[PDB]
């Protein structure tokens, strides 16, 4: 019925809007990740345990898992824009 349909469209819309804010928030929290990563650098200056961590991270974000996760999310968003 018309009413059920409207209720469902409202649900979806709200659900979608939440997913948008959640993502926008996750993106913001990444500045903490930024700060943390720079701190890891400073510690890498003197500590080689830190240096090894950093390099692992760098490789991860360039051709590793992090980069793939990243490309995955980005392409899904591009797919969404696509269908619009």
């Amino acid at each position: 019925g018309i009413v059920s349909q409207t209720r469902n469209k409202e649900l979806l819309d709200k659900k979608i809007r939440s997913e948008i804010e959640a993502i926008k928030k996750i993106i913001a929290e990444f500045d903490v990740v930024k700060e943390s990563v720079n701190e890891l650098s400073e510690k890498a200056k003197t500590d080689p345990q830190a240096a090894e961590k950093l390099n692992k991270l760098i490789e991860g974000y360039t051709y590793g898992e992090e980069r793939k996760l990243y490309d995955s999310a980005l392409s899904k968003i591009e797919k969404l824009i696509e269908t619009l």
Partner: protein
């Protein structure tokens, strides 16, 4: 920034912002037809949510794996 987060996040944020306004635009805009078109919108909106939540999960794993890596 050591791991070029600036560009990664900037491009990602741009994708989201573009999607957000475009969705917002659709969102705010014979009886049989009407009932069918809405059923179709509900189908699309549903997939959107799925693809959108998948993206969200990925960005979370990203965060988790990054932070995990910075601490061990």
């Amino acid at each position: 920034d050591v791991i070029d987060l600036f560009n990664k996040l900037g491009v990602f944020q741009a994708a989201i912002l573009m999607f957000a306004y475009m969705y917002q635009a659709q969102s705010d805009l014979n009886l049989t037809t009407t009932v069918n078109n809405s059923q179709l919108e509900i189908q699309q909106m549903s997939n959107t949510l799925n693809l959108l939540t998948s993206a969200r999960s990925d960005m979370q794993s990203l965060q988790y794996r990054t932070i995990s890596g910075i601490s061990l």
